[PDB]
Ligand binder design. Structure first.
Ligand SMILES: CCCCCCCCCCCCCCCCCC(=O)OC[C@H](COP(=O)([O-])OCC[N+](C)(C)C)OC(=O)CCCCCCCCCCCCCCCCC
Ligand SMILES: CCCCCCCCCCCCCCCCCC(=O)OC[C@H](COP(=O)([O-])OCC[N+](C)(C)C)OC(=O)CCCCCCCCCCCCCCCCC
Ligand SMILES: CCCCCCCCCCCCCCCCCC(=O)OC[C@H](COP(=O)([O-])OCC[N+](C)(C)C)OC(=O)CCCCCCCCCCCCCCCCC
Ligand SMILES: CCCCCCCCCCCCCCCCCC(=O)OC[C@H](COP(=O)([O-])OCC[N+](C)(C)C)OC(=O)CCCCCCCCCCCCCCCCC
Ligand SMILES: CCCCCCCCCCCCCCCCCC(=O)OC[C@H](COP(=O)(O)OCCN)OC(=O)CCCCCCCCCCCCCCCCC
Ligand SMILES: CCCCCCCCCCCCCCCCCC(=O)OC[C@H](COP(=O)(O)OCCN)OC(=O)CCCCCCCCCCCCCCCCC
Ligand code: SF4
Lengths: 57, 318, 115, 70, 174, 83, 155, 98
């Protein structure tokens, strides 16, 4: 069994074309990337305080 | 007393640059699930000092094939322009109050392109020159949109006086009136300071460090200070242009607090772009500017000339 | 003149930072240390590498666009005339001609970074 | 975690606040406790030059009211 | 402080001598932009604020910038230096001494007749005495380009469009 | 009908930037000529008193020139106060 | 006496130099990935002021992370020469230390210390990211005990 | 005339002499042309501001834009010549003697 990774054709109606035009002109997926980085900024870092803390063996 | 004013403008700006290095490193670290500087001083607060001290005691290798006159003139021009860009800024009252303040900024920032054209040429190496030429072409191409966007926005101001921007934005931000021009202006400012996906002249994974390969220690440090001063200055210009703060003539400290907070927010956004996107190709950003930004900018300049006339909303020229 | 003092201070302090930056460190230089950097080898000088008509064409097109921008800068004061219809006609005329220059460069290859 | 970035931001904020406050206070100090007079146009400059002449102390900002003559 | 326009003009002429003696074009361009900066300052001292800032933004940051960019591409294998020729030194020295001799003669005589009659009585002396009101006369004159200068706008815009077409014709190279 | 709608469809689907720019430029071209307020802008520009209004000598037969600034003669800015 | 001022100045300069140890990414082989693991969030070499640097002109320490071959040694020495001073070399892994698994090969130089002077030898194949971090902190402590200005004062 | 006018006209004369006295590079001559234009700009600006010829305030703008258009044309010509000969040397522009 296999699957296609990039074999979807975009829809070509009024609403979908307007969705893509708004995504083009208003940078919505760039805003999603900014949101992902902003969400990572408010997560506790995985850093340990070496040498006072040590990696597990 | 005016000399003290000049000094108390310049020195805090350089300190703000020094700690902007730390702030950028920490923001990048926390967006990347790490910490960043937290060992050298409390929360890395002495790290900029460590960097500045290490740099000025490191051997500044000058190239054997370098015209030293321009090799040292380029950092002087860069830092002098980066500092003098703050003298007309209306933190409530400017150091220098001109009729044509934003025109003055446009001219001074257009003179800053020489520091790359002279550093790349002076460094020789026959390859950093190509990176310098790419940087100069990018800079001059985005100067077009900077100038036209500034022109269109100022048609509500009525003059080139920056103090008038405070009056123009008394009841409403200029963002609510020109947000498309605000996005294009912000990306143009991103591109002019060689930041974010527009950092082609110093692509860490494209050309190592481009025009700054041969510079080391001290002159490299001053170039860095010039770039970060330009970053903070451009964000201050953006805040004053689009997010005008309310002014109390009897309490200008409120305006200063407002302006500083908004400038810091825009600078943190500049560092936010750095941590979120891949890098544009040179031809790709040139295509963006010339075929995407420029037509919309021309159309919006047309719109913003038509709009005050057809609504009887032309501002005063005084 | 205050502005002249400000420029003098900025330039003077930048040059002083050069002087400390470029004289304070302790130096020890040899031939292979200051050799031009080429990722671990020596660079070829070749012969006038910075070429290609496209780099010059973008500069020229920026120059002409910058001239039209110079023509557009007086606009904030131009809207203060009683003869607003003539002024609007001429400003829009200049902007259509800017758009026409952009379109002509665009359609006739122009802005393209070709093979 | 993220709030440890705040110290550097606070240092930046203080360093950026200093210029505006210093400019405002120097302007108040050197202009008679009032805002530094703005002369974008020759009429305002002429107003200030008249102000300097009538003050008797060669300072435009020393304001003579109806107590001077009437 | 008493004389500012004269130092600016002497430096202007010195820069002209420097770049017109024609060293390698990068130093000629450096001299040209120094001359342009001091000339922008000269016209700033005369009340031409917009015109001087135009000098800056379009000449020094536009036209020049483009000139230095194009020199950085079409140059010599070892791009030349000022010192490399005795002709550059001779031309610059002769120009500097003909500047010094004539400025000394004009300062101490005030009636030189090199082609034109000149009197260095000052430079502030020729300024008129009056008020310009609540506007910059220069800005009002330049903003009249769109109301009074319709024909000028027409011909200049046509020439700029023709310039784009012309540059694309010439550089095609076939 | 369908030809222009299809062209607008293709342009909106592939070049939204050019569609937006041409629409904005067209409106900037067209809208001022239909605005009732353009004449108002002209009038506001005309009512701004940059110069001194140097007076006239009443040779008699000047019944429409005021005499005093607060005489019921000469143009009025009451229209501008409410606009 | 005046040796107290020189000692304080040396302490200041050596604190500034070890608080901003900017290394150069010389990733030759398997040791390169453990070094970017010391870069990774778990160890976060940037929290020590140890940045991700670039061209040797702004690098303070060379990390030789991987096998040095005969074909590659001239480039390593070239970039070592191009480093501004003061500069340090950390040899990471058995291959860089003394040849390692490939010690008896025709094409492998037996230890980078035949090519450059080495300050710290980090053992392991590969050394764990924690071992490399320990070597980096040990290098920092080497810098702390330098007495360059006190050497000069007694010359 | 005041001595600023003397120095401005002197700058024009020096630029004219520098342009007429050629050297190898074409770019140097083009820079001399640009200096001639800049001196003309400053002379026009001084004359126009001093006599308060208000409508003539726009003349320096027109002079600047037209001379920069000519400079663009000359730069393109130089680039074509260089692509022919690898240099902008005027001595290569001599094959029309025959
Ligand atoms: C290092 C390289 C630095 C490059 C830039 C140097 C500064 C240039 C800008 C100077 C200020 C300016 O233009 O302000 C415009 C602004 C424009 O606005 P403004 O003129 O309307 O300002 C208010 C003026 N009134 C009150 C009349 C309305 O003007 C000023 O700030 C002051 C005007 C008078 C200035 C008098 C001195 C001029 C000196 C110019 C520089 C001369 C040297 C140039 C470099 C030479 C190098 C060899
Ligand atoms: C009555 C009203 C009349 C007037 C109406 C005015 C028009 C209103 C509708 C227009 C909306 C769009 C305005 C312009 C947007 C940009 C134009 C453009 O080309 O975009 C697509 C362009 C190009 O997109 P593209 O590559 O997908 O498309 C290119 C062209 N095609 C489709 C053919 C391939 O994209 C960008 O510009 C990307 C920018 C990269 C950087 C991203 C930064 C993200 C973070 C932004 C934060 C916020 C910024 C501002 C901050 C605050 C500042 C104060
Ligand atoms: C093709 C070029 C088209 C240019 C725009 C058409 C004319 C615009 C206009 O209203 O011009 C008025 C102007 C001026 O007329 P006006 O009625 O606006 O009066 C202006 C009065 N002052 C100067 C005091 C402000 O027309 C001209 O000046 C005619 C110039 C020749 C036009 C030739 C076009 C071909
Ligand atoms: C932002 C930055 C703003 C400016 C900050 C200035 C900070 C000043 C504090 C001290 C800075 C470093 C001084 C020492 C230089 C580096 C060093 O270790 O040199 C060792 C060297 C060692 O010299 P040496 O003669 O023993 O060895 C050289 C010869 N070889 C290498 C072959 C062995 O010291 C000197 O050369 C003499 C230093 C004299 C004292 C300088 C005191 C400070 C002066 C500035 C204040
Ligand atoms: C209803 C209201 C109107 C809706 C909009 C209608 C018009 C839509 C816009 C025009 C679309 C034309 C067709 C098109 O898509 O052309 C694309 C083409 C090439 O584009 P390119 O990205 O280079 O792609 C090359 C191949 N890969 O493009 C080209 O080859 C040349 C394009 C030139 C564009 C010039 C733009 C100049 C500035 C215009 C805006 C300013 C105002 C000017 C006056 C406008 C008056 C209306
Ligand atoms: C009214 C008052 C006068 C107004 C005019 C301004 C006069 C002063 C300013 C002078 C400006 C620069 C003049 C020289 C220009 C120049 O570059 O001349 C080059 C010319 C030939 O150069 P080239 O062929 O390269 O020489 C051989 C190289 N191997 O060089 C030569 O042929 C050799 C001589 C060089 C110096 C000549 C200077 C003459 C100045 C006065 C005469 C011109 C006017
Ligand atoms: S020491 Fe071991 S892990 Fe490191 S490069 Fe050599 S073989 Fe690979």
């Amino acid at each position: 069994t296999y699957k296609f990774v990039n074999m979807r054709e975009p829809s070509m109606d009024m609403k979908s074309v307007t969705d893509r035009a708004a995504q083009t002109l208003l940078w919505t997926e760039l805003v999603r990337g900014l949101g992902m980085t902003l969400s990572y900024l408010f997560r506790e870092p995985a850093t340990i305080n070496y040498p006072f803390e040590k990696g597990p063996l | 007393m005016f000399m003290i004013n000049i000094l108390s403008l310049i020195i805090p700006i350089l300190l703000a640059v020094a700690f902007l290095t730390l702030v950028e490193r920490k923001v990048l670290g926390y967006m990347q699930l790490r910490k960043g500087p937290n060992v050298v001083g409390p929360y890395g607060l002495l790290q900029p000092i460590a960097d500045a001290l290490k740099l000025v005691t490191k051997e500044p290798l000058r190239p054997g094939t370098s015209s030293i006159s321009m090799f040292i003139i380029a950092p002087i021009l860069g830092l002098s322009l980066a500092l003098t860009m703050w003298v007309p800024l209306p933190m409530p009252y400017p150091l220098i109050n001109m009729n044509l303040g934003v025109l003055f900024m446009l001219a001074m920032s257009s003179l800053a392109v020489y520091s790359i054209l002279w550093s790349g040429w002076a460094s020789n190496s026959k390859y950093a020159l190509i990176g310098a030429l790419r940087a100069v072409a990018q800079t001059i191409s985005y100067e077009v949109t900077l100038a036209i966007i500034l022109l269109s926005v100022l048609l509500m101001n009525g003059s080139y006086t920056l103090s008038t921007l405070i009056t123009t934005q008394e009841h409403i931000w200029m963002i609510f009136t020109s947000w498309p021009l605000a996005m294009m202006w912000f990306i143009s400012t991103l591109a002019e300071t060689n930041r974010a996906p527009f950092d082609l002249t110093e692509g860490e994974s494209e050309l190592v460090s481009g025009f700054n390969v041969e510079y080391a220690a001290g002159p490299f440090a001053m170039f860095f200070m010039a770039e970060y001063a330009n970053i903070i200055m451009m964000n201050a210009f953006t805040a004053i242009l689009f997010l005008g703060a309310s002014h109390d003539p009897h309490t200008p400290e409120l305006y200063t607090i407002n302006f500083v907070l908004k400038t810091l927010a825009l600078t943190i956004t500049f560092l936010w772009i750095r941590a979120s996107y891949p890098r544009f190709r040179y031809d790709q950003l040139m295509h963006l500017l010339w075929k995407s930004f420029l037509p919309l900018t021309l159309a919006l300049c047309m719109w913003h000339i038509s709009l005050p006339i057809m609504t009887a909303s032309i501002p005063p020229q005084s | 003149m205050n502005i002249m003092l400000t420029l003098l201070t900025n330039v003077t302090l930048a040059s002083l930072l050069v002087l400390i930056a470029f004289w304070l460190p302790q130096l020890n230089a040899y031939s292979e240390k200051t050799s031009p950097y080429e990722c671990g080898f020596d660079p070829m000088g070749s012969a006038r590498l910075p070429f290609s008509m496209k780099f010059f064409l973008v500069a020229i097109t920026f120059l002409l666009f910058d001239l039209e921008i110079a023509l557009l800068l007086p606009l904030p004061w131009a809207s203060q005339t009683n003869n607003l219809k003539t002024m609007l006609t001429m400003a829009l005329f200049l902007l259509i001609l800017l758009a026409a220059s952009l379109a002509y460069e665009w359609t006739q290859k122009g802005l393209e970074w070709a093979e | 975690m993220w709030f440890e970035i705040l110290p550097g931001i606070a240092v930046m904020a203080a360093c950026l606040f200093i210029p505006g406050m210093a400019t405002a206070h120097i302007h108040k100090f050197t202009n008679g406790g009032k805002e530094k007079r703005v002369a974008h146009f020759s009429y305002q400059w002429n107003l200030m030059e008249r102000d300097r002449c009538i003050s008797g102390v060669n300072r435009y900002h020393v304001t003579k009211g109806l107590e001077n003559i009437d | 402080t008493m004389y500012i326009a004269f130092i600016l003009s002497t430096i202007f002429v010195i820069g002209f001598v420097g770049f017109s003696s024609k060293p390698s074009p990068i130093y000629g361009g450096l001299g040209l932009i120094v001359s342009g900066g001091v000339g922008c300052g000269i016209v700033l001292n005369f009340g031409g604020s917009f015109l001087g800032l135009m000098v800056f933004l379009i000449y020094l940051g536009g036209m020049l910038v483009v000139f230095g960019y194009t020199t950085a591409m079409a140059t010599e294998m070892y791009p030349e230096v000022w010192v490399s020729n005795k002709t550059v030194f001779g031309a610059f020295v002769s120009g500097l001494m003909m500047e010094f001799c004539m400025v000394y003669y004009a300062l101490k005589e005030e009636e030189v007749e090199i082609i034109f009659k000149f009197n260095g009585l000052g430079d502030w002396v020729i300024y008129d005495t009056g008020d310009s009101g609540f506007f910059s006369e220069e800005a009002m004159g330049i903003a009249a380009l769109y109301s009074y200068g319709t024909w000028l706008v027409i011909v200049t815009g046509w020439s700029l469009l023709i310039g784009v077409v012309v540059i694309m014709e010439i550089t095609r190279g076939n | 009908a369908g030809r222009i709608a299809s062209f607008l469809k293709n342009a909106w689907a592939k070049e939204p930037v050019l569609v937006a720019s041409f629409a904005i430029g067209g409106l900037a071209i067209i809208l001022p000529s239909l605005s009732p307020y353009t004449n108002y802008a002209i009038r506001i520009n005309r009512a701004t008193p940059y110069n001194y209004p140097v007076p006239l000598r009443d040779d008699g037969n000047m019944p429409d020139v005021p005499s005093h600034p607060q005489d019921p003669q000469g143009p009025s800015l009451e229209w501008l106060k409410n606009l | 006496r005046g040796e107290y001022v020189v000692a304080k100045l040396d302490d200041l300069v050596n604190w500034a130099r070890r608080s901003s140890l900017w290394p150069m990414t010389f990733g030759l082989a398997c040791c390169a990935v453990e070094m970017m693991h010391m870069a990774a969030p778990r160890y976060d070499m940037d929290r020590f002021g140890v940045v991700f640097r670039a061209s040797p002109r702004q690098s303070d320490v060379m990390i030789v992370a991987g096998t040095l071959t005969n074909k590659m040694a001239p480039a390593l020495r070239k970039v070592y020469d191009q480093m501004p001073e003061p500069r340090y070399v950390v040899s990471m892994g058995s291959c860089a230390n003394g040849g390692g698994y490939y010690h008896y090969s025709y094409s492998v130089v037996r230890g980078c210390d035949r090519i450059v002077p080495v300050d710290i030898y980090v053992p392991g194949c590969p050394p764990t990211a924690e071992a490399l971090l320990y070597g980096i902190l040990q290098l920092q402590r080497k810098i702390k005990r330098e007495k360059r200005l006190r050497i000069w004062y007694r010359r | 005339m005041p001595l600023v006018y003397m120095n401005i006209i002197m700058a024009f004369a020096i630029a004219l002499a520098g342009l007429l006295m050629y050297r190898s590079h074409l770019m140097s001559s083009l820079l001399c042309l640009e200096g001639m234009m800049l001196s003309l700009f400053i002379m026009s600006t001084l004359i126009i501001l001093n006599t308060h010829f208000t409508l003539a305030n726009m003349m320096p703008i027109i002079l600047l834009v037209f001379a920069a258009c000519e400079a663009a044309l000359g730069l393109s010509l130089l680039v074509m010549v260089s692509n022919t000969y690898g240099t902008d040397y005027v001595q290569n522009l001599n094959l029309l003697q025959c």
